[PDB]
Amino acid sequence: RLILPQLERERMAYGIKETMLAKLYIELLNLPRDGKDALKLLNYRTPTGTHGDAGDFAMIAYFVLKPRCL
DNA sequence: AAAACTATGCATGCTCTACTGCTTCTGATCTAGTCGACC
C-alpha cells in the first residue's frame, strides 16, 4: 500500500496536497512566514531558486529538511 | 462671681461605591482558495 499508493482504497482521501502540505510544514517547523524557505515551498514551481529542482516538491522539501532532521 | 465638665457643630482624612472613556477579546460575516472525483 506504500509502494503503490494510487491503488489504495481502504484509506480515505488525505485532504492535503502540495499547498496544504507546504503550509503545514511551515507551521510545524516554525519557519518564518516570509522567509526564503517558506516562499520556496509555497511557490515550488517558480525556478527563481536556480538550485535543486524547479518542479519537484519532494526534492525541495528534502533540501529544506536536510539541515533540520536526524 | 469664677472654674470645671459636658453637648453640639464643623473641619479633616481615609475608605468605599457609581459612571465615563480607552483597550482588548470574542463572535459573526464575507471573500478567496484548495481538494476529490468524475468526465
UniProtKB/Swiss-Prot annotation:
Superkingdom in the source lineage: Eukaryota
Compartments where found: Nucleus
Disease per record: LIG4 syndrome: Characterized by immunodeficiency and developmental and growth delay. Patients display unusual facial features, microcephaly, growth and/or developmental delay, pancytopenia, and various skin abnormalities. Severe combined immunodeficiency autosomal recessive T-cell-negative/B-cell-negative/NK-cell-positive with sensitivity to ionizing radiation: A form of severe combined immunodeficiency, a genetically and clinically heterogeneous group of rare congenital disorders characterized by impairment of both humoral and cell-mediated immunity, leukopenia, and low or absent antibody levels. Patients present in infancy with recurrent, persistent infections by opportunistic organisms.
Subunit structure: Interacts with XRCC4; the LIG4-XRCC4 subcomplex has a 1:2 stoichiometry and XRCC4 is required for LIG4 stability. Component of the core long-range non-homologous end joining (NHEJ) complex (also named DNA-PK complex) composed of PRKDC, LIG4, XRCC4, XRCC6/Ku70, XRCC5/Ku86 and NHEJ1/XLF. Additional component of the NHEJ complex includes PAXX. Following autophosphorylation, PRKDC dissociates from DNA, leading to formation of the short-range NHEJ complex, composed of LIG4, XRCC4, XRCC6/Ku70, XRCC5/Ku86 and NHEJ1/XLF. Interacts with DCLRE1C; the interaction is direct. Interacts with APLF.
Annotated protein name in UniProt: DNA ligase 4
Function as written in the Swiss-Prot or TrEMBL entry: DNA ligase involved in DNA non-homologous end joining (NHEJ); required for double-strand break (DSB) repair and V(D)J recombination. Catalyzes the NHEJ ligation step of the broken DNA during DSB repair by resealing the DNA breaks after the gap filling is completed. Joins single-strand breaks in a double-stranded polydeoxynucleotide in an ATP-dependent reaction. LIG4 is mechanistically flexible: it can ligate nicks as well as compatible DNA overhangs alone, while in the presence of XRCC4, it can ligate ends with 2-nucleotides (nt) microhomology and 1-nt gaps.
Transmembrane segments: none
Tissue specificity comment: Testis, thymus, prostate and heart.
Taxonomic source organism: Homo sapiens (Human)
Entire protein: shown range: 69 to 138 of 911
Record family assignment: Belongs to the ATP-dependent DNA ligase family.
